[PDB]
Symmetry: C3
Subunit: 451 residues, 3 copies
């Protein structure tokens, strides 16, 4: 009965950089097959416009602000991570008889208690930090040189990958390696006789921009060097997905597996991405920062060849997966999303008359976003709040706040109300950021929620 679940998350994948979500230049046949025989989502949102807090939200089902995880972890390492008392969806599923696997990027804490194996994943194969260099032939010599020199703070992008806490010596381009271990994970799952949960966290197409020549060779008409490199990186993810689907079919897992494919946040335009038709990109509270491609694939359950047009949150995956797995959630987990399945099946808005938030901190102020029904409220760059009918003005060109004053004020005040149980950040991505936070009396919600 109970389905296997695969959550595939690309890292900094631009909105228009898969074929099912409008790519004209990058070609993603295998990812598009899953979209063509499943349902894609035109209004899918992550809980934060960059990696660490977005991933924290995927795993915990909570806005990262509620659990002190509003910032990326310190870039040079730390002994902190996403709080251990917020149960990960993997742990919940593992407690309900799932064989659990995590692959690739973690970015949620690298201490013993924060490690994938202590957050409910039986299997982990990957790198624990914010990304990685893609070619072992490049990074392994650099790590050797630095380690032999006696350095202990070695940049996490060149450190060896690990398998369940034991270091390995990777031989393949990282995207191919993660795809290979996805196949290995689902092949191991055959014998288990319970259902499985796989969290596949590709670092592609996140920087550094490094692609195989064989992949870049498939895009001879992309003349921009970065865009061709980026295209090659995305194509490697597509090959990977193809290799995984192959294995699922061989093992007779394909038909009873829910596959979710998405990005952790918007594309970085200066590093090869395209977020058309959305404004801006990674880190923004404009749509381009936190509105992402998403597809569901599960034959006979997810309708084939459809596009779901109502708002869905990455926060919804926790209770949705939980309900589909027959795993009970507790009220004291304070889940911020909803089980979207009943509304999804009726082609209705699972967040009818309810807001979806983004709140991204900057130096001495915060940018914010509110999506509810047709409306997108926007607080950016210390401008006054703006309002867009996002259903007809997806690119956020036509501020209609002047003619909907009471509605806008109401949305902002509800966000203000929501903000009070946000915890003080438990860390920042740089030491100076934490010092500035304190110096600036943050959060400056007097500015953020001013109407």
């Amino acid at each position: 009965q109970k389905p296997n679940i695969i959550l595939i998350v690309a890292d900094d994948l631009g909105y228009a950089d898969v074929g099912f979500n409008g790519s004209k230049d990058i070609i993603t046949p295998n990812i598009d097959d899953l979209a063509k025989s499943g349902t894609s989502f035109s209004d899918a949102y992550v809980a934060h416009p960059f990696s660490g807090p977005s991933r924290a939200a995927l795993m915990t089902g909570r806005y990262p602000h509620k659990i002190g995880s509003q910032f990326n972890l310190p870039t040079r390492g730390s002994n902190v991570g996403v709080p251990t008392d917020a149960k990960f969806i993997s742990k919940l599923l593992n407690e309900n008889n799932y064989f659990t696997g995590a692959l690739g990027k973690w970015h949620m804490g690298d201490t013993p208690q924060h490690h994938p194996n202590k957050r409910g994943f039986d299997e982990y194969y990957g790198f624990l930090g914010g990304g990685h260099n893609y070619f072992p032939d490049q990074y392994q010599p650099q790590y050797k040189k630095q380690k032999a020199q006696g350095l202990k703070n070695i940049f996490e992008y060149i450190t060896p990958l690990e398998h369940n806490g034991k270091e390995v010596k990777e031989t393949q381009y990282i995207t191919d390696a993660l795809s290979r271990e996805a196949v290995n994970f689902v092949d191991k799952a055959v014998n288990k006789k319970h259902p499985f949960f796989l969290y596949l966290a590709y670092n592609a197409p996140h920087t550094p921009l490094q692609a195989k020549d064989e992949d870049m060779a498939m895009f001879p008409n992309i003349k921009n060097k970065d865009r061709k490199t980026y295209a090659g990186m995305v194509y490697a993810v597509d090959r990977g997905v193809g290799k995984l689907v192959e294995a699922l079919k061989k093992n007779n897992q394909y038909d009873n597996t829910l596959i979710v494919f998405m990005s952790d946040n918007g594309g970085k335009l200066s590093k090869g991405a395209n977020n058309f038709p959305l404004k801006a990109g990674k880190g923004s509270t404009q749509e381009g920062g936190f509105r992402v491609p998403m597809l569901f694939h599960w034959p006979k359950h997810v309708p084939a060849g459809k596009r779901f047009s109502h708002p869905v949150s990455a926060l919804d995956l926790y209770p949705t997966f939980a309900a589909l797995a027959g795993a009970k959630v507790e009220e004291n987990q304070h889940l911020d999303g909803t089980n979207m399945w009943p509304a999804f099946i009726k082609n209705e808005n699972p967040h009818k008359d309810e807001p979806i938030y983004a709140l991204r901190h900057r130096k001495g102020y915060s940018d914010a976003a509110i999506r509810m029904n047709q409306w997108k409220a926007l607080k950016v760059n210390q401008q006054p709040w703006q309002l867009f009918n996002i259903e007809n003005d997806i690119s956020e060109k036509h501020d209609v706040s002047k003619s909907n004053k009471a509605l806008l004020t109401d949305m902002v005040r509800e966000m203000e109300k929501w903000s009070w149980d946000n915890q003080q950040p438990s860390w920042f991505h740089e030491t100076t950021e934490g010092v500035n936070w304190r110096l600036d009396a943050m959060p400056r919600f007097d500015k953020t929620f001013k109407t």
Copy 2:
């Protein structure tokens, strides 16, 4: 054996605005009956000079500073409240076989976990915020208009009352409605065969100043408009108390019930109150802010026709009620008051040689108060500490700090010692207040405890 307990709390009731505590113009016959056949308290103190933290202290038996509840909750709503790990007196009594009821004003959190029904009250009938408009005929149309317009942040003074989480349509003037449900609560209690605890939290005579014509008609010689309205509001509370006593007598509950009547803080002089002979009023650390009327009534147990002249704290009610109920308290609850009954029965000071504190935060500084034996230390308006022999100088006219230097310094240093386990505020009543707190490096206890 074990007595029923009723805690009646008026909201912003002035010190001289009941007959038993010296009113010459407002007439409160039923409240005065309870005083005449019981004991009133000339030196009764609440733990904070305004609502939210005072109520937090009544329920938890802790100074609100110890539990992060030094401020009123955000006026436009929030998902925060008085910490769930500080057990409410209602919860303790409920755990020891009491049928528990709360009526009227809450002001201690409106989330599911902070709701009266989750803080140990079997029955709740009231409004969860800081107050309410008094006439359904006035507020219900306003709420209809706003709700039909699609507004979600609706001012809590016009929102519908509820009964155990289900919304109701109130038909009576709020003070009469709460009195009616007090009767209903004690009538329900007859069948239960356990003792009962009723927390009756009238919003009268708190703003808005709104009275029935029939009540105002009883004060033809009060020419000041606000004072007449206020008098009418207090008279409605007296009628209510009378209606409740009536029901207690009918049910044979009267003789074995401990009735406590008090205010949550001092009267607001600009909104109809009189705190004679005390200086200042609501929010002050002068006596007028946190010294309140109080009576106990319990035939054969509380002496009849007496006035107890020693300091008593609202903090004492938790362990006193607990002891009278045979409910065990634990050392790790960190109760800040004392079981006052043994000293009360011997007509001795239950806080002999021990301080009672007030500490009220302002913009960039704090006002403070210390009551111990005959002495009142006062820190106000960024003036140097003052000292009064409050037994001979109740109006705080004669600063004798110059001639008791060592005593004053000693009292202040003991308060400074007490301040270290005060928690940072978990919320503020406005966003800007919290920003100013952070900007001003609060608490500025270098100013507050300077000698």
Copy 3:
């Protein structure tokens, strides 16, 4: 089988002020006997360069920064202390069948929950604060005068000593009294038939500088008044140790007891100490502040007549004692030291390629220290980081940072990484210190970890 353990800690004992660690003027025959038949440590470090946080670290096995105890407790008293959820080594040993005793200075909280008897000591005889006056004849009349005057905030240096919460009337010079009760403790231990742990926390030679004439008489060639007084104070500790060893031999405990003797921090040069050949003293992150004398004595187990030359931390005592006692440690205790015994027995560095830290907060900035293998990194007085080859430059005269840039930067970045799970201080030693902390947006780790 399992050994008794005695941890003797002098308070502000200078580096060169015992004979085994190079004293030419102070003579410490009994302490030197333990060194001569045991192993002394040339590179022994406490976790903080002053009392409260150093002691917190000894007892918890954690850097005090991890548990909010980076500052001394408020000098005029408080209701805070070292967190009750960090299990004390005494509690652990008590749970593993040890008879436990603490003597003399506590300085880790004086509330019921923070009291020695609630932190795993069966016996406590001493004073709970930061120090004490040494002559009962002097302090007892002062305390009587103040107590009879009705003062409640009485300076903790004159308050009566206590035995398990009950006040006593001490008749001897405090150092002699503590020594006497050490004898009484080990005599009580004879009957118990389990092993024992004694924590002997002398306040000597900490201020006030007060010595017996009979002790000062032994140093006729010390002409400096303070140095002679200080010498006499240290000699009283030596007599005490001699009296204790006497009792251990009488009771047949000597041979199966591990005796550790050390200081809580470096000597205060302006109050009689000598830290030769180390730079600076008490409170500094120069070697003189946190590098201390230390000896182990345990016949047949600790080699006799040796000097161990590798870094050892006071943090190591918790897991080392635990392992020697057969007491299990849990991963979730987050111990910061190591069981040094296996490396110690092989004459190898128990902190090979691993740092030992000091981080001491000042007004608006922090001083820091890193010891790893031959290297000492130093951050002091808001100067740029310095680096010394501490093995050939113990006095920190020759900054070689210019020629080891990459190593120094790497060490600092590793400290920066370590800093993220440091908690905000739960208290300060003065109210103004806490206000300045907040005003200065502390910690200013942007300055501290700048390279």
